[PDB]
Amino acid sequence: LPVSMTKTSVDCTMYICGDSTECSNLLLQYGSFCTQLKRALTGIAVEQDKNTQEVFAQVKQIYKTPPIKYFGGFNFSQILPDPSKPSKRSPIEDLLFNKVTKGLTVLPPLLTDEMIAQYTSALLAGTITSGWTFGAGPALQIPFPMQMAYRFNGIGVTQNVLYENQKLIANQFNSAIGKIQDSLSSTPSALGKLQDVVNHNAQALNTLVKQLSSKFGAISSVLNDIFSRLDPPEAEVQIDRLITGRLQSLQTYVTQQLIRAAEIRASANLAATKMSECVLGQSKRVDFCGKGYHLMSFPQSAPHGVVFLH
Amino acid sequence: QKLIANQFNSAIGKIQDSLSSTPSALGKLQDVVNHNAQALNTLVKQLSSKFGAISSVLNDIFSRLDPPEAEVQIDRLITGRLQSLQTYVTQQLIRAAEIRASANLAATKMSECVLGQSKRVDFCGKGYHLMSFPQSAPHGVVFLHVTYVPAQEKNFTTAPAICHDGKAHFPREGVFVSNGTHWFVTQRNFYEPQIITTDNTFVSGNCDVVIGIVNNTVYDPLQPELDS
Amino acid sequence: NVFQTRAGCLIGAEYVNNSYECDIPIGAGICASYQSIIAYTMSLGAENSVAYSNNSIAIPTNFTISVTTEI
Ligand SMILES: *[C@@H]1O[C@H](CO)[C@@H](O[C@@H]2O[C@H](CO)[C@@H](O)[C@H](O)[C@H]2NC(C)=O)[C@H](O)[C@H]1NC(C)=O
Numbered sequence: 001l002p003v004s005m006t007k008t009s010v011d012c013t014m015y016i017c018g019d020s021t022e023c024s025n026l027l028l029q030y031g032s033f034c035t036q037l038k039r040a041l042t043g044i045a046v047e048q049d050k051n052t053q054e055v056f057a058q059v060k061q062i063y064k065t066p067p068i069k070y071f072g073g074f075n076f077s078q079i080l081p082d083p084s085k086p087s088k089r090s091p092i093e094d095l096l097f098n099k100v101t102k103g104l105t106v107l108p109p110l111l112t113d114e115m116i117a118q119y120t121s122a123l124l125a126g127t128i129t130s131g132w133t134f135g136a137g138p139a140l141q142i143p144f145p146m147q148m149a150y151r152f153n154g155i156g157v158t159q160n161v162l163y164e165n166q167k168l169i170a171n172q173f174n175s176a177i178g179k180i181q182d183s184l185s186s187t188p189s190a191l192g193k194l195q196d197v198v199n200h201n202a203q204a205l206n207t208l209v210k211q212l213s214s215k216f217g218a219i220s221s222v223l224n225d226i227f228s229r230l231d232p233p234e235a236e237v238q239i240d241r242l243i244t245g246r247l248q249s250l251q252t253y254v255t256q257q258l259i260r261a262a263e264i265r266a267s268a269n270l271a272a273t274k275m276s277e278c279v280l281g282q283s284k285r286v287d288f289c290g291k292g293y294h295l296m297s298f299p300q301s302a303p304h305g306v307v308f309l310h
Numbered sequence: 311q312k313l314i315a316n317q318f319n320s321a322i323g324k325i326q327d328s329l330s331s332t333p334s335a336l337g338k339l340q341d342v343v344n345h346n347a348q349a350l351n352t353l354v355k356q357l358s359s360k361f362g363a364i365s366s367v368l369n370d371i372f373s374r375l376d377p378p379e380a381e382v383q384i385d386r387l388i389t390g391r392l393q394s395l396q397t398y399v400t401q402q403l404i405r406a407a408e409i410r411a412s413a414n415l416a417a418t419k420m421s422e423c424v425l426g427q428s429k430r431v432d433f434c435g436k437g438y439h440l441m442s443f444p445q446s447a448p449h450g451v452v453f454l455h456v457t458y459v460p461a462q463e464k465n466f467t468t469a470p471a472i473c474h475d476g477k478a479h480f481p482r483e484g485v486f487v488s489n490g491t492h493w494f495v496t497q498r499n500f501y502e503p504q505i506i507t508t509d510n511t512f513v514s515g516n517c518d519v520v521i522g523i524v525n526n527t528v529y530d531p532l533q534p535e536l537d538s
Numbered sequence: 539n540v541f542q543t544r545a546g547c548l549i550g551a552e553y554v555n556n557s558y559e560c561d562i563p564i565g566a567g568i569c570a571s572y573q574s575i576i577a578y579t580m581s582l583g584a585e586n587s588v589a590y591s592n593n594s595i596a597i598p599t600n601f602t603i604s605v606t607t608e609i
């Protein structure tokens with residue numbers, strides 16, 4: 001699920017006129033289009049940080065996994081943080097990170113990837129060591145086999161079914177998580193959504209930049225050419241034409257960014273709901289947290305998004 | 311009953327005081343109002359732009375210039391103002407879509423938290439949901455989510471099952487806990503120990519397969535009746 | 539009073555090794571606050587460790603009725 005876009009900013013004066021000061025003098029005749037565009041882009045930028053804040057910062061305690069990693073035969077090494085890595089990322093998180101690749105700036109996000117990884121590690125430790133109790137109050141520790149027995153009891157299967165087949169269930173879970181690692185590694189189109197987000201932002205910026213080399217009906221694309229090769233009285237007309245064309249281009253870019261931001265916000269709200277209802281508890285809603293009767297989910301951070309293991 | 315009533319009353323009073331004592335509590339509704347006012351103000355301020363014409367007043371353009379070029383100047387002003395008004399309408403449509411999404415969420419919250427009890431986690435407030443109470447606000451709604459929060463936990467020793475007479479007993483709805491010497495069964499969300507009997511436990515197989523099973527006796531309610 | 543961040547150069551604020559909740563977000567994990575003006579790395583939350591073991595359970599012995607708002 002995508003969560004946030006790239007925070008971008010525009011300098012209206014530098015984009016429209018470059019560094020010709022009399023062009024800026026003429027641009028003052030247009031009023032507050034530049035202020036409008038700056039305001040809209042700033043709103044989008046703060047909305048992205050709000051999206052990440054809503055999705056990931058759901059616990060105010062940074063829980064730590066115990067030093068001994070025995071959980072009744074279940075093997076969480078593929079999703080728990082790896083101290084060997086300098087970035088302290090789990091193998092799945094590391095694979096996800098590797099697999100996703102003029103007046104215009106790209107602002108950095110407020111939360112660094114290390115902080116997002118630390119949130120995901122806290123959520124994993126809380127859901128492994130305390131079940132769903134940490135999402136509804138103080139964290140109450142419970143042995144993992146007993147938690148998984150509770151979760152079978154939640155889907156209409158009695159506890160003895162788990163307690164008599166604990167080894168088989170542990171083996172199936174470990175094999176399944178290994179298969180997840182292999183499948184996510186071998187297939188490139190699995191992460192299509194985040195890559196599409198990145199590609200859309202990059203191509204929008206590229207087209208906006210390429211729009212600077214359009215004549216827009218005037219005789220030249222260079223302001224100083226208009227100045228030198230033409231006398232002022234209709235050089236003003238040419239400058240007005242170029243300015244209004246570039247302003248239209250920037251308006252189009254901002255409008256498309258607003259629509260895409262609305263879509264990304266919808267996706268981020270969905271991701272926050274999925275976290276709250278599948279990770280911090282067990283969901284009875286059909287097909288909301290995977291195909292089958294849901295038991296638990298595990299969050300994994302990805303570039304510009306989040307990955308759930310249902 | 312009395313303790314729960316007292317806690318509820320104190321919580322309601324605290325909600326009133328917290329709303330009175332925090333300025334940015336209604337920031338979302340204030341943002342709606344501010345966004346609308348600012349958009350209208352920008353639209354009316356934009357009316358004083360020349361858009362490359364000799365003046366921003368139509369009467370001056372008409373009373374100063376010959377119509378053959380007065381029409382060019384008027385075309386400039388008209389197209390600029392029309393573009394600004396289009397921009398206003400487009401941003402209004404986008405904001406309307408956002409408010410539509412928020413209103414759909416509010417309707418869902420009403421139907422699921424106010425008209426019933428919701429099992430969805432964190433949908434109707436933090437904690438286990440008991441009930442919600444709606445309150446009207448300017449351009450919005452305010453929900454008072456009454457929720458149940460556990461407190462004052464205590465460590466115990468637990469076992470998955472009890473082996474008795476070569477049989478394995480499992481709790482019906484509770485969990486096996488030990489205070490150090492004796493074993494009880496209590497429900498999960500509130501410590502209430504009880505004697506382990508055959509009424510609150512069910513048998514399944516022998517005690518050779520379960521890992522962590524412990525030895526204990528299981529009282530039979532029917533034995534003393536026949537002992538007399 | 540010159541500090542170098544991933545976002546850029548911040549001039550006029552003191553960097554402190556302490557950590558607080560974010561007040562004025564700067565970017566790349568740096569926040570600013572007025573306590574003069576100080577810059578710091580935001581604190582994700584209060585650290586906590588839960589005593590996991592395979593034969594220990596924690597059961598609540600009381601409860602609290604809580605009321606929250608949502609606008
Ligand atoms: C838990 O899973 C991990 C990963 O599958 C296991 O680590 C493997 O250990 C064997 C031998 O110890 C190595 O040959 C493999 O290369 C390891 N895997 C990786 C990805 O490095 C681990 O043995 C499993 N069990 C426990 C108790 O940790």
Ligand SMILES: *[C@@H]1O[C@H](CO)[C@@H](O[C@@H]2O[C@H](CO)[C@@H](O)[C@H](O)[C@H]2NC(C)=O)[C@H](O)[C@H]1NC(C)=O
Pocket residue numbers: 489490491492
């Ligand atoms: C564990 O619980 C048992 C059952 O209540 C306790 O045994 C009773 O304890 C009370 C007071 O502690 C005495 O008045 C009773 O006479 C005891 N009855 C029996 C049959 O022993 C036991 O003391 C508890 N253990 C701990 C460490 O609290």
Ligand SMILES: *[C@@H]1O[C@H](CO)[C@@H](O[C@@H]2O[C@H](CO)[C@@H](O)[C@H](O)[C@H]2NC(C)=O)[C@H](O)[C@H]1NC(C)=O
Pocket residue numbers: 473524525
């Ligand atoms: C629970 O009870 C069973 C049966 O009384 C115990 O099983 C006996 O264990 C002893 C000691 O190892 C053996 O010498 C006997 O042969 C076992 N008998 C049977 C029928 O299996 C069991 O040990 C008890 N649980 C614990 C933890 O001691």
Ligand SMILES: *[C@@H]1O[C@H](CO)[C@@H](O[C@@H]2O[C@H](CO)[C@@H](O)[C@H](O)[C@H]2NC(C)=O)[C@H](O)[C@H]1NC(C)=O
Pocket residue numbers: 313316317462599600601602
């Ligand atoms: C459960 O918690 C409540 C408070 O949430 C306790 O009630 C308090 O009890 C003390 C001593 O009896 C009184 O001084 C307080 O005024 C009570 N508070 C309220 C709000 O009534 C209660 O005693 C606790 N129960 C247990 C078993 O720990």
Ligand SMILES: *[C@@H]1O[C@H](CO)[C@@H](O)[C@H](O)[C@H]1NC(C)=O
Pocket residue numbers: 068070522591592593
């Ligand atoms: C509990 O965990 C320890 C290691 O942390 C292990 O040696 C021990 O056997 C476990 N106990 C049970 C009953 O599984």
